[PDB]
Design a protein around this ligand. Sequence first.
Ligand SMILES: [Cl-]
Ligand SMILES: [Cl-]
Ligand SMILES: [Cl-]
Ligand SMILES: [Mg+2]
Ligand SMILES: [Mg+2]
Ligand SMILES: [Mg+2]
Ligand SMILES: [Mg+2]
Ligand SMILES: [Mg+2]
Ligand SMILES: [Mg+2]
Ligand SMILES: [Mg+2]
Ligand SMILES: [Mg+2]
Ligand SMILES: [Mg+2]
Ligand SMILES: [Mg+2]
Ligand SMILES: [Mg+2]
Ligand SMILES: [Mg+2]
Ligand code: NA
Ligand code: NA
Ligand code: NA
Ligand code: NA
Ligand code: NA
Ligand code: NA
Ligand code: NA
Ligand code: NA
Ligand code: NA
Ligand code: NA
Ligand code: NA
Ligand code: NA
Ligand code: NA
Ligand code: NA
Ligand code: NA
Ligand code: NA
Ligand code: NA
Ligand code: NA
Ligand SMILES: [Sr+2]
Ligand SMILES: [Sr+2]
Ligand SMILES: [Sr+2]
Ligand SMILES: [Sr+2]
Ligand SMILES: [Sr+2]
Ligand SMILES: [Sr+2]
Ligand SMILES: [Sr+2]
Ligand SMILES: [Sr+2]
Ligand SMILES: [Sr+2]
Ligand SMILES: [Sr+2]
Ligand SMILES: [Sr+2]
Ligand SMILES: [Sr+2]
Ligand SMILES: [Sr+2]
Ligand SMILES: [Sr+2]
Ligand SMILES: [Sr+2]
Ligand SMILES: [Sr+2]
Ligand SMILES: [Sr+2]
Lengths: 119, 115, 246, 145
Amino acid sequence: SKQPDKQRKSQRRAPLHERHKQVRATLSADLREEYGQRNVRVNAGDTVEVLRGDFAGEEGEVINVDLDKAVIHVEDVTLEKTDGEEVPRPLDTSNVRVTDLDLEDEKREARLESEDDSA
Amino acid sequence: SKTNPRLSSLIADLKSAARSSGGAVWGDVAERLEKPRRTHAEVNLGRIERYAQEDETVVVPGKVLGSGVLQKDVTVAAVDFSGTAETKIDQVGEAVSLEQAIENNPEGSHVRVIR
Amino acid sequence: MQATIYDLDGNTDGEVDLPDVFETPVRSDLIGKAVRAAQANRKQDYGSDEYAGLRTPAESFGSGRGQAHVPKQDGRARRVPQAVKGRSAHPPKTEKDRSLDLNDKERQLAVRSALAATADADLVADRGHEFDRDEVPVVVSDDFEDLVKTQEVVSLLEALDVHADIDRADETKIKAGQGSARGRKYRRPASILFVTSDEPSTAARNLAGADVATASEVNTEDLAPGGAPGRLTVFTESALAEVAER
Amino acid sequence: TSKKKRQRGSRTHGGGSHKNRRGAGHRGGRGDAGRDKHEFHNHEPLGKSGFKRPQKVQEEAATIDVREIDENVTLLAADDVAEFRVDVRDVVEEADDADYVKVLGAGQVRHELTLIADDFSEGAREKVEGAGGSVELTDLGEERQ
RNA sequence: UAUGCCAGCUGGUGGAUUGCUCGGCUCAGGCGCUGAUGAAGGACGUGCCAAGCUGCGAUAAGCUGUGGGGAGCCGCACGGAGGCGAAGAACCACAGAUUUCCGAAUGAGAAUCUCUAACAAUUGCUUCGCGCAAUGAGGAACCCCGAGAACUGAAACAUCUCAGUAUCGGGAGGAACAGAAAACGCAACGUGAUGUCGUUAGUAACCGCGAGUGAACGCGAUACAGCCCAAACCGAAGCCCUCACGGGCAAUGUGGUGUCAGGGCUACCUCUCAUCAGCCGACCGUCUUCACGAAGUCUCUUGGAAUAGAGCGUGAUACAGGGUGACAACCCCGUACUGAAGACCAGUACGCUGUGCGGUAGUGCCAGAGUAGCGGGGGUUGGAUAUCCCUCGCGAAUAACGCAGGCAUCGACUGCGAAGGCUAAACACAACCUGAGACCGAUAGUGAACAAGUAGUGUGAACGAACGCUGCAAAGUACCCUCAGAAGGGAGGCGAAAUAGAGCAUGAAAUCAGUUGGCGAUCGAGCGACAGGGCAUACAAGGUCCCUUGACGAAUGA
RNA sequence: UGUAUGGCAAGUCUAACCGGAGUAUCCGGGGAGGCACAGGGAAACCGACAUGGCCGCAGGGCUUGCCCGAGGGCCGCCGU
Ligand SMILES: [Cl-]
Ligand SMILES: [Cl-]
Ligand SMILES: [Cl-]
Ligand SMILES: [Mg+2]
Ligand SMILES: [Mg+2]
Ligand SMILES: [Mg+2]
Ligand SMILES: [Mg+2]
Ligand SMILES: [Mg+2]
Ligand SMILES: [Mg+2]
Ligand SMILES: [Mg+2]
Ligand SMILES: [Mg+2]
Ligand SMILES: [Mg+2]
Ligand SMILES: [Mg+2]
Ligand SMILES: [Mg+2]
Ligand SMILES: [Mg+2]
Ligand code: NA
Ligand code: NA
Ligand code: NA
Ligand code: NA
Ligand code: NA
Ligand code: NA
Ligand code: NA
Ligand code: NA
Ligand code: NA
Ligand code: NA
Ligand code: NA
Ligand code: NA
Ligand code: NA
Ligand code: NA
Ligand code: NA
Ligand code: NA
Ligand code: NA
Ligand code: NA
Ligand SMILES: [Sr+2]
Ligand SMILES: [Sr+2]
Ligand SMILES: [Sr+2]
Ligand SMILES: [Sr+2]
Ligand SMILES: [Sr+2]
Ligand SMILES: [Sr+2]
Ligand SMILES: [Sr+2]
Ligand SMILES: [Sr+2]
Ligand SMILES: [Sr+2]
Ligand SMILES: [Sr+2]
Ligand SMILES: [Sr+2]
Ligand SMILES: [Sr+2]
Ligand SMILES: [Sr+2]
Ligand SMILES: [Sr+2]
Ligand SMILES: [Sr+2]
Ligand SMILES: [Sr+2]
Ligand SMILES: [Sr+2]
């Protein structure tokens, strides 16, 4: 649908498996060349570099990925609460870039390398 | 007020001649054209044949239509002619636009107004 | 008159006779009438629910309690136009005919007149198009219909000194008002119309502001968007010929 | 600006006293109410008049005046050119869905014509014959008797 | 100066306004039945903690399989504890398991429980045994068959009209109904089943001949399709149940033949590719879903944040739409192109098997009765003598006869065979799926953007609201003081901003507190307009104004 | 039923619908049918001035008052 209300609606109500595409980030130049893909679903093992927020320029390992809220926790990308406890400042994966992947999963590595499919 | 830019210009030109040159018909025709379309002339050939004479331009402050027979070798000047009117007129004479008549005869001389 | 054909490199390659239609006296009022018709005819019927505000057994108490004779239900006024939650006195109606008729002869004349407005460089520039050229419309060979890449059509246009019009239409405007909430957030200038003969140029269609069409069915709108005559167009040798009997 | 467009602020919208534009009383009744009483003026009088013959017993003739034929003789080059000769049945539009073709005699006949039709008026003949012409009645035209 | 008036300022109150849209409204395409194999609906349950909603059903936010999917997950709902998932969970598609009680509700009774084997009730078949079956109830409207108002209009009113409308009873389907001429009647040397659309036409016709009411034949289109009995002549050659055995039906006729291109019978010519039964069984298209899918996240400046400005660069069969800390073709989802699946079209079309089309001559063998038709009384219709129907009475012929062609009878002419039956497609609606919009934008639009048919009212039928917005990120305010205090307050911390601090964007008016200017306790009331004085006034967006004298100098005029 | 504007003109317009396509727009096709092209008469039935006279506005002409004079006005005559 070209209608905005329907667009937003389908994104906010997409089922869990369809929410994977809502946590995808662009790949670095070397990775794009190595896997023939422009982007990939950020995983909790991948290393990422912040390209946009107040944390732009920072590098870190992805500590968490929430499909429900479609955001990720990157290491050291935090906010200091009033009590002093540092807590994660969620990031939209579109403001982030993948520099290193976590290929421990046979299935993930397979999808990344296959030409007919994407990950 | 008219909406056709052409008719609008034709009237402006009819006036410019009536004023500049000595033509009194062009201003007379301009005044009729400025009037409501329903009052404009819808003249068939049978009327031109009845009241027109050679060497006297027929001036129609409106449109000429194709009903009837025209035998006289006359020059008809009008805002417009139906496809058939123009065709029938040229077989025995000459159908001319008002815009042409104003240029050829800005003094508006030797001309008969027909409606 | 005569129109100069151009090869896919931007160089002259002979010339043909510009058809008589391009000599049709420009009639912006008729063109505007035609475009108003086309635009109105694609408008959808709408109207509020015929029973909105009428779903209540509300009744007026009449005289006696120092209150206006307004129908009420459970203490709250209802139904009537002046009451909150009441019906709309004269709302939009689905039954309404939102279409406009146009005599074929009148519309066919508007097409020809619009076509003719294309052959006037001053009109085209007046309409707003950006280009450095004298001869217009821009006539090109039939091999144009075999182009596949958009990037290639760009080069040909830069060679024809007509690409500036695309840089003009390369600016999306974010409209003022709630149209945005209905999917009408953006709009952009109308640039070049590409008229072909066999099929609409898939290669030129994505160009900013461009519109592709075919000789047999090119209409008043693509010829004069918004009813404004004189659009920067580019015909095809065969399109140019086929358009003559329209 | 239209008349309607200038109404906001007028209160009465041209109706005069606000006691005017109420129901059908302001019209003197609904539709043609009172056509023989208070609004009898400019109404056709009450009553029955005449009779109608059944639709399928009624004949409808396709007619043309000599003037129409005579004015198009040259333009009718697709037809016979004798010493002209024209079968009216092939000239009149809507001749099929009509019981017969009749030539009426209005206008002048400035040519020698040989017309063939189902019927002719006294005037049609006089005009055609008096101009060195002739009138040929069709086989269907052999009704006159 | 008290009480107080006018205007403003600071802060409230209030929630208008502006911006925003998870909801509506409307149009369009597709698709369309469910139920005794117990539906739809309802009740009550079901979670670690669980009130609402959603889901589910004692296997209770779930169990199994296959496929997809993928490193996460444990609904709405961001908690605490804990758990699940590479033994591939979540999540999605298809299929299956489970599936309490009431409910058509069916063993009997009952306000969702109870009492002692149940198709209750009505039917068909029948081994005459509930053994095998059927019906019931639901569904947004649409459809078909029945019952059938009144306000109203007629400027009153009765016929007429509103209207065969509202409403009521009964019933089917995915569509219904209709339908292969006892037709039409541009009267013909003509048309050729039926719906529907455009037109014919506000024509004909009706009507206190008032107001009003109102077709059809035909024509142009859409879609096209044509058949089966009864009987003649045959006469058990037949059908149903059962694996079989065997049983049931059937001479009151199962089955063959046959159906106006009449047929049968007798005698003949030739032939079939009609029809009917049955087998096989789509392409394409359409709707929906899915796979794949190009190109910048480069420099400087501003900013809390670049999607901004300037500069440089790229894709495009893709410059639709959305998301992302501000305006994004190139950051993310998508979009073009190409491809796949399901559904519908459709068990249809094409193909095939079987059967056999047809013609001549003779033959008064057959061809639907309370019928055709007439009369009495009503309703209905445009139907007028000439609509369709109901009711009461009467009542025919037999194809060599009969009916129709808008009054009756007789004759001619033309058409056509009633009183048996079936029938695809083209059309209605909108539950359901998807798409769309010069529609509305939170007092609007649905009653319902929120707990919405919710809260709440009524014995009941029924009636029925209001409530949208912190922030880029919860960073949702640690510590300290005060206090009866998890309140509130002070100080303090976060953030671009807390006058963004929780019904937390903006924050109008009415109006309230404090306060500034003017007036003010000897004085008069449409609150002002126009003149002219006092007092008051940061900048900006206005820059003029005063007096001597002089020039000009209308009417008037010492 | 008027009016203003616009198209075409003794004609004019398509309706349902069909094809195309960029697929509600739009291009092409469709004239069925409507209105106009003759009227009068209940009906049967019959069927008309493409101009014969005079006046004359605007306009044109001439040797400057005299001519030609569309439209208009008054009559004739024509159909029923
Ligand atoms: Cl005329
Ligand atoms: Cl009659
Ligand atoms: Cl017929
Ligand atoms: Mg790959
Ligand atoms: Mg409302
Ligand atoms: Mg606005
Ligand atoms: Mg019971
Ligand atoms: Mg009344
Ligand atoms: Mg009366
Ligand atoms: Mg009626
Ligand atoms: Mg009929
Ligand atoms: Mg049989
Ligand atoms: Mg009645
Ligand atoms: Mg509301
Ligand atoms: Mg606020
Ligand atoms: Na209600
Ligand atoms: Na009051
Ligand atoms: Na409409
Ligand atoms: Na009033
Ligand atoms: Na006919
Ligand atoms: Na469906
Ligand atoms: Na709960
Ligand atoms: Na279930
Ligand atoms: Na049963
Ligand atoms: Na039994
Ligand atoms: Na009345
Ligand atoms: Na009364
Ligand atoms: Na009556
Ligand atoms: Na982003
Ligand atoms: Na009777
Ligand atoms: Na008949
Ligand atoms: Na609200
Ligand atoms: Na026609
Ligand atoms: Sr969730
Ligand atoms: Sr959530
Ligand atoms: Sr009283
Ligand atoms: Sr008035
Ligand atoms: Sr009223
Ligand atoms: Sr009277
Ligand atoms: Sr016709
Ligand atoms: Sr047929
Ligand atoms: Sr019979
Ligand atoms: Sr008779
Ligand atoms: Sr409110
Ligand atoms: Sr009560
Ligand atoms: Sr503070
Ligand atoms: Sr005092
Ligand atoms: Sr003086
Ligand atoms: Sr036409
Ligand atoms: Sr005259």
